[PDB]
Write a protein that binds this ligand. Structure first.
Ligand SMILES: [Zn+2]
Length: 257
């Protein structure tokens, strides 16, 4: 019964998930004045040409756009990563107001939302095995600010009415996640965790420097989603973000000078 309410939000999660107070928790604040350029980092390789989206699901905490991860169809390689990481799903975190919503912050700045493209390391065979490993996942995080619309988001926006409440799913084929990327693949990277329970410390985070812009109408439609199931009391799916956690004994590295 974890969530983002008064009585079950991030400050409570440690009671059921004690790693919430662990050494490698996410998100974090990215201090651009202390992150250091690392010339050993490589460019990211994002290979999404063969991606096969299947379905969109409201899980009661966000919605996931799910992919076929039974072959190397949509993969992330390079950057800080060794090996090949397969796209399994993407989802977002967003606010009730345009001045909050992101999980990572940049010099304490909060963005309106944050996109997470989740990938698992193929050496571990399946997502469930991967999350048990320190290098099991690679998450590409992308900030959203409100401004111009993002045309490549609109197909997501338009299906939201079909998945208003927890537990609803809808077919969602042929969606192209390349339409959610910014122009630049410059990034910061650090070792961390899932940002929702079970909060496992299995993630190489790759957070893009350049945000995407979405329109105010696009974000408004996200805010019409519900955390509750159909026929339960309506609670808008907003502010489904975890705040920044202590960096502890980690360094954030930049791919760019
Ligand atoms: Zn996330």
């Amino acid at each position: 019964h974890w969530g983002y309410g008064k009585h079950n939000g991030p400050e409570h999660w440690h009671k059921d998930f004690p790693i919430a107070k662990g050494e490698r928790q996410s998100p974090v604040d990215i201090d651009t004045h202390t992150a250091k350029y690392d010339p050993s980092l490589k460019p990211l390789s994002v290979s999404y040409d063969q991606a096969t989206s299947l379905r969109i699901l409201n899980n009661g905490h966000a919605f996931n756009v799910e992919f076929d991860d039974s072959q190397d169809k949509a993969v992330l390689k390079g950057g800080p990563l060794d090996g090949t990481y397969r796209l399994i799903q993407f989802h977002f975190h967003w606010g009730s107001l345009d001045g909050q919503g992101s999980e990572h912050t940049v010099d304490k700045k909060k963005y309106a939302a944050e996109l997470h493209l989740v990938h698992w390391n193929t050496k571990y065979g399946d997502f469930g095995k991967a999350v048990q490993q320190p290098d099991g996942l690679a998450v590409l995080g992308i900030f959203l600010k409100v401004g111009s619309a993002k045309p490549g988001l609109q197909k997501v926006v338009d299906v939201l009415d079909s998945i208003k409440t927890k537990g609803k799913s809808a077919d969602f084929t042929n969606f192209d996640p390349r339409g959610l990327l910014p122009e630049s693949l410059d990034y910061w990277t650090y070792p961390g965790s899932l940002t929702t329970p079970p909060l496992l410390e299995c993630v190489t985070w790759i957070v893009l420097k350049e945000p995407i812009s979405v329109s105010s109408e696009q974000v408004l439609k996200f805010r019409k989603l519900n955390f509750n199931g159909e026929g339960e009391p309506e609670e808008l799916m907003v502010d489904n973000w975890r705040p920044a956690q202590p960096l502890k004994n980690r360094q954030i590295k930049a791919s760019f000078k």
